[PDB]
């Protein structure tokens, strides 16, 4: 979708494996601000929105 009409998808009741997204070199910009990408695989999440 467009930037002014961005869509937000609900992610709940599932296992999220972030190691595959981190090990993929196709992404040109992958920078976190609250946590580190290495500790994502060992931590739960209350609500996930993309």
């Amino acid at each position: 979708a467009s930037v002014y009409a961005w869509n937000r998808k609900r992610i709940s009741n599932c296992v999220a494996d972030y190691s595959v997204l981190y090990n993929s070199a196709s992404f040109s910009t992958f920078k976190c601000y609250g946590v580190s990408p290495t500790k994502l695989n060992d931590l739960c999440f209350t609500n996930v929105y993309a």
Partner: protein
């Protein structure tokens, strides 16, 4: 109120420890007050800060 001089000493000795325990819960400018919460979300270079 006969033993007020001792009651005040006991109350102060308890309130000092209470204030210390409460200040243990302060953030001091960090992202969280719990040590394990910071040690398990950020990398070493970012956790040491």
């Amino acid at each position: 109120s006969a033993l007020g001089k001792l009651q005040d000493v006991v109350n102060q000795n308890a309130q000092a420890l209470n204030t210390l325990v409460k200040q243990l819960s302060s953030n001091f400018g960090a992202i969280s007050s719990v040590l394990n919460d910071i040690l398990s979300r950020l990398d070493k270079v970012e956790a040491e800060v």
